Amino acid sequence: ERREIAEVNKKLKQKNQQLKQIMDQLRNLIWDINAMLAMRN
Amino acid sequence: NERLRALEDIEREIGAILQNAGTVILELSKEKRLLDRQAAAFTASVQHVEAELSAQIRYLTQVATGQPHEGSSYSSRKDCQMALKRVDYARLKLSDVARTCEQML
């Protein structure tokens, strides 16, 4: 049946949301120069 | 380090043997060993110390009115510490990203 398909889809969606949260944190952790390039060297 | 070495040498030579040379003439208590101490350390050491002191006295005398010998007084040494702070913030952000990645396992 498609129950396993739905379970795998839900697991993949949860992993995608987790990866998206990690990427969101990485955005702020990765700009890191835009705020302070005005006096960077 | 020139002036520092000169001051160190003057300090090391401040306690000369001239103050201890007051027991050199009494060395002739065996006939009418270390009799040489009554020649080199009697007055020549004191003369050399006085000459060195006089030389050190007659310096350029730079300080006249205000505050010379400055040299920090100013800019981005502060911003150097600020860049160290940016490095620390980047460290904190990298640690947060690593914690997020670990949670992603």
Curated annotation (Swiss-Prot), chain A:
It is found in: Nucleus. It comes from Homo sapiens. Belongs to the Mediator complex subunit 30 family. Component of the Mediator complex, which is composed of MED1, MED4, MED6, MED7, MED8, MED9, MED10, MED11, MED12, MED13, MED13L, MED14, MED15, MED16, MED17, MED18, MED19, MED20, MED21, MED22, MED23, MED24, MED25, MED26, MED27, MED29, MED30, MED31, CCNC, CDK8 and CDC2L6/CDK11. The MED12, MED13, CCNC and CDK8 subunits form a distinct module termed the CDK8 module. Mediator containing the CDK8 module is less active than Mediator lacking this module in supporting transcriptional activation. This is Mediator of RNA polymerase II transcription subunit 30. The gene is MED30. It comes from the Eukaryota. Expressed in brain, heart, kidney, liver, lung, pancreas, placenta and skeletal muscle. Component of the Mediator complex, a coactivator involved in the regulated transcription of nearly all RNA polymerase II-dependent genes. Mediator functions as a bridge to convey information from gene-specific regulatory proteins to the basal RNA polymerase II transcription machinery. Mediator is recruited to promoters by direct interactions with regulatory proteins and serves as a scaffold for the assembly of a functional preinitiation complex with RNA polymerase II and the general transcription factors. Residues 1-36 form a coiled coil.
From Swiss-Prot, chain B:
InterPro entries: Mediator_Med11. It is linked to Neurodegeneration with developmental delay, early respiratory failure, myoclonic seizures, and brain abnormalities: An autosomal recessive disorder characterized by congenital microcephaly, profound global developmental delay, exaggerated startle response, refractory myoclonic seizures, progressive widespread neurodegeneration, and premature death. The keyword Iron-sulfur does not apply. GO terms for biological process: positive regulation of transcription elongation by RNA polymerase II; positive regulation of transcription initiation by RNA polymerase II; protein ubiquitination; RNA polymerase II preinitiation complex assembly. It comes from the Eukaryota. Its main location: nucleus. Pfam families: Med11. Component of the Mediator complex, which is composed of MED1, MED4, MED6, MED7, MED8, MED9, MED10, MED11, MED12, MED13, MED13L, MED14, MED15, MED16, MED17, MED18, MED19, MED20, MED21, MED22, MED23, MED24, MED25, MED26, MED27, MED29, MED30, MED31, CCNC, CDK8 and CDC2L6/CDK11. The MED12, MED13, CCNC and CDK8 subunits form a distinct module termed the CDK8 module. Mediator containing the CDK8 module is less active than Mediator lacking this module in supporting transcriptional activation. It is found in: Nucleus. The keyword DNA-binding does not apply. Keywords: Acetylation, Activator, Disease variant, Epilepsy, Neurodegeneration, Nucleus, Transcription, Transcription regulation. Component of the Mediator complex, a coactivator involved in the regulated transcription of nearly all RNA polymerase II-dependent genes. Mediator functions as a bridge to convey information from gene-specific regulatory proteins to the basal RNA polymerase II transcription machinery. Mediator is recruited to promoters by direct interactions with regulatory proteins and serves as a scaffold for theee assembly of a functional pre-initiation complex with RNA polymerase II and the general transcription factors. GO terms for molecular function: transcription coregulator activity; ubiquitin protein ligase activity. It comes from Homo sapiens (Human). GO terms for cellular component: core mediator complex; mediator complex; nucleoplasm; nucleus; ubiquitin ligase complex. This is Mediator of RNA polymerase II transcription subunit 11. Belongs to the Mediator complex subunit 11 family. Coiled coil: none annotated.
